[PDB]
């Protein structure tokens, strides 16, 4: 797809039927989200499942690839469909913080399209505070009126009411971390939750106010390399605190994630605290696992 040249010349036809793609998406989404909820007792609802497993949530998790790594989130995704896809972060995030055996067969999926959405997604849902700068956001664009007309929640911390910030996720996070609990205990947050931050802030940090001086601090997102500092050390407390529990694919998918992040650390001050990855990882170097 070529986003660019479709917002700035192309026909209201394809136009609104992508709209309608994109907003058909999140309804099927929506009413996934209820049904599931309410349907602990299992079929319709199978074949509805199916067809989210098996191409909805990858095709659109693929687009979401796409959108992130040809930039082009910087053209379609503006009006409207923004808040159809706040509508996914409520869907995905309920699917992520969703305790059912029923989805614990297909959650490894979800985290990839969680991940692929929040490389995507251009507005700041984890910086609440700060959103008053995103010319992206809808409460800047849409207006107050327009959003009263429409179904916005005409709240910054209402926009996502479950969804967690970044600073009350990173509370968490160093929580859990110092707690140093069994992988089966909580894997929810380390199949989910480290991929959404770790693609937000491979997208976010270059819009860091640190990396243009100029218009600093009313840039749109704060996300500083202090920050991304924070989550090295997440990454690293987690890893060594899950070595020795019983590990898995999913860290391997977990440290592919890391691969784009690591690339922001520089080969020097990767010492020290990867040294320690170094040598806890080459004499435990007998694992399928492989870093780097």
């Given amino acids: 797809l070529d986003a660019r040249t479709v917002m700035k010349t192309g026909l209201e036809s394809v136009k609104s039927a992508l709209r309608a793609f994109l907003d058909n998406a999140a309804e099927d989404l929506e009413k996934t989200m209820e049904n599931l909820k309410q349907g602990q007792f299992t079929k319709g609802v199978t074949q509805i499942i199916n067809y989210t497993t098996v191409a909805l949530l990858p095709m659109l998790s693929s687009l979401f690839e796409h959108i992130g790594q040809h930039q082009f989130g910087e053209d379609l995704i503006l009006e409207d469909v923004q808040v159809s896809c706040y509508r996914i972060l409520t869907s995905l995030y309920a699917l992520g913080t969703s305790k059912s055996i029923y989805v614990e067969r297909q959650r490894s ?46 709240n910054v911390e209402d926009v996502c009411p479950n969804i967690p910030s970044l600073e009350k996720l990173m509370e968490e996070i160093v929580e859990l971390a110092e707690s140093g609990i069994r992988y089966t205990q909580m894997p929810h947050v380390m199949e989910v939750i480290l991929p959404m931050l770790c693609s937000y802030m491979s997208r976010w940090w270059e819009h860091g106010p640190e990396n243009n001086p100029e218009r600093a601090e009313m840039c749109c997102t704060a996300l500083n390399s202090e920050h991304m500092n924070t989550l090295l050390g997440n990454i690293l407390k987690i890893i060594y605190n899950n070595l020795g529990i019983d590990e898995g694919a999913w860290m391997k998918r977990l440290a592919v994630f890391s691969q784009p992040i690591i690339n922001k650390v520089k080969p020097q001050l990767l010492k020290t605290h990867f040294l320690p990855l170094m040598e806890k990882l080459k004499k435990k170097a007998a694992t399928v696992v492989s870093e780097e």
């Avoid at 959405?117 to 700068?133: M, N, R």
Wanted: hydrophobic share 45%; net charge neutral; charged share 15%.
């Fill in 109 to 154: 999926a979800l985290g990839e399209c969680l991940a692929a959405f929040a490389g995507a997604f251009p507005v700041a849902f984890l910086e609440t505070h700060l959103d008053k700068h995103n010319i992206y956001s809808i409460y800047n664009t849409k207006s107050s009126r327009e959003r009263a007309a429409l179904s916005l929640p005409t």
